[PDB]
């Protein structure tokens, strides 16, 4: 659980053979986590939204994805979910970029086939079609011979920001409004973030890069924070365990449901304590510091996503 992990949650990186292979829909939790390990979710996203053929993450899988900045805390725990991961699990949507979605400076974009960043009001992904990759500015997809196989290394995927996503405790609208107000009081000179009204202004400068801590608590936009405290609570509920049928791969949905509800399977010490125990299927803890709980503005919430990442902001003009 708490120990930092250098590797997949459950599944070793994919060795695909057929760029035209189907991406099956899998119902089981561990089946989905295996796909997350293999970057099959980012491959699916690229096929749906960019008319890309094949896969990203060939041989490398999720733990060889690129981050901006390279110094990244939450990737040291394989079990902490990124926005693309949370999207695959149905907790949020990484949307297709529109031209008005601002591409932040700083990442090294040249050659990427996919990148995403949190935005003030969501999560946006940028893709490229077959045989293409991003220019240095990230603005266009140009022709690239190195992508011909359609079985691309994980370095072709870029995730922007230090981000952890998790099941949240939903809050009332009135709690969100109070959090938003405290946020406005901490950044009173900020007008728009990623094109979204943050404070009312008359004049404002052009958008400039903006590095900020933030949390996603549902509702219409993120809460950006300067003074705030975070704490990690270790939890041991069923999302905290994955199940492997060793030899075959991840356990099936029905096998996993049985282990987690009926105490008739194998697992690590914590899984036997909470779920019960007796080849077979075995379930063990994923690696993370826990669930993040945020104190801000006199309140305390369990958000959907928390992190530090780069957005675009406009400042008020006198």
């Amino acid at each position, epitope marked *: 659980d708490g120990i930092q992990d*250098s590797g997949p949650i459950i599944c070793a990186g994919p060795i695909h053979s057929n760029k035209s292979a189907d991406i099956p829909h899998l119902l089981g939790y561990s089946e989905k986590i295996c796909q997350i390990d293999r970057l099959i979710h980012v491959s699916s996203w690229l096929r749906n939204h960019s008319q890309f053929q094949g896969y990203v993450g060939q*041989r*490398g899988g999720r*733990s*060889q*994805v*690129s*981050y*901006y*900045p*390279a*110094e990244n805390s939450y*990737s040291r725990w394989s079990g902490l979910l990124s926005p693309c991961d949370a999207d695959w699990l149905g907790m949020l949507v990484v949307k297709k970029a529109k031209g008005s979605d601002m591409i932040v400076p*700083g990442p*090294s974009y*040249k*050659g*990427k086939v996919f990148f995403e960043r949190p935005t003030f009001d969501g999560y946006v992904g940028w893709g490229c079609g077959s045989g293409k*990759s991003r*220019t*240095e*500015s990230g603005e*266009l997809c*140009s*022709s*690239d*011979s*190195g992508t011909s196989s359609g079985l691309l*290394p*994980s*370095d*072709r995927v870029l995730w922007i920001g230090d981000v952890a996503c998790q099941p949240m405790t939903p809050i009332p609208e009135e709690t969100f409004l109070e959090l938003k107000s405290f946020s406005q009081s901490e950044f009173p000179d900020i007008c728009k973030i990623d094109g979204i009204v943050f404070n009312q202004c008359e004049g404002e400068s052009l958008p400039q890069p903006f590095d900020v801590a933030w949390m996603d608590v549902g509702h219409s936009h993120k809460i950006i924070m300067r003074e705030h405290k975070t704490k990690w609570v270790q939890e041991s509920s069923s999302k905290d365990f994955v199940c492997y049928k060793e030899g075959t791969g991840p356990c099936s949905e029905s096998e996993e449901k049985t282990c987690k509800t009926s105490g008739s399977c194998r697992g690590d010490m914590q899984f036997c304590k909470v779920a019960g125990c007796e080849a077979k299927c075995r379930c063990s803890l994923v690696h993370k510091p826990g669930e993040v709980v945020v104190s801000y503005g006199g309140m305390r919430v369990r958000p959907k996503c928390y992190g530090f990442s780069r957005m675009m902001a406009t400042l008020e003009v006198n």
Partner: antibody
Amino acid sequence: EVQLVESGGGLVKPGGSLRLSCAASGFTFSNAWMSWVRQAPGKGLEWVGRIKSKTDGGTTDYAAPVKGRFTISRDDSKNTLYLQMNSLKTEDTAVYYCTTDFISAGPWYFDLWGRGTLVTVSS
Amino acid sequence: SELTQDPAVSVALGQTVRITCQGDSLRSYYASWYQQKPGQAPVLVIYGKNNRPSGIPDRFSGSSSGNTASLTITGAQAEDEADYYCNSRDSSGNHVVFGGGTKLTVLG
């Protein structure tokens, strides 16, 4: 079949001039950033400079020790990278490599190298 | 700005050695790593976050932490005796900077 071949190396007098070229094959040369990297005998690798693809502005950048005397250029129609060396000093004596990022796309991930050509600056 | 490497490091045949590169660019951007044997052109072995070019065995691996990047070689062989260079972009992004190199000696 994807390869880079440097040529033009040889003996040049101190203060002299020398043009290196690099012939690329097996890929669309026009899409590639092309870099020169040199290594004086027994010393470390030293980036000389690069020219970007036209897609990215086709601009040039040079290491400080060669700025002003070295000029990089490309002719996409003949698949060739150039390094024009002027005012050569004896410490410019090195093996010169052209290199690019072919499969490991990214400005400094040099996975494709030529074999290098030796330049000797001597009297 | 510059990448600092140790000039020399030894490892016993079959053992693990770790070569470290340090520089302020590495907080934002990844290093890449090059193996150069005498009389030969450099060969790229690690780039990005622990990506291997095709034909590079996973005995070579990459990591970064803070302003340092590290190359780790498990099960050292005689064929690993080489100079190992890290590189990266500078602050502006207009240049490429190589580390000074680390000569790896394989004992035994």
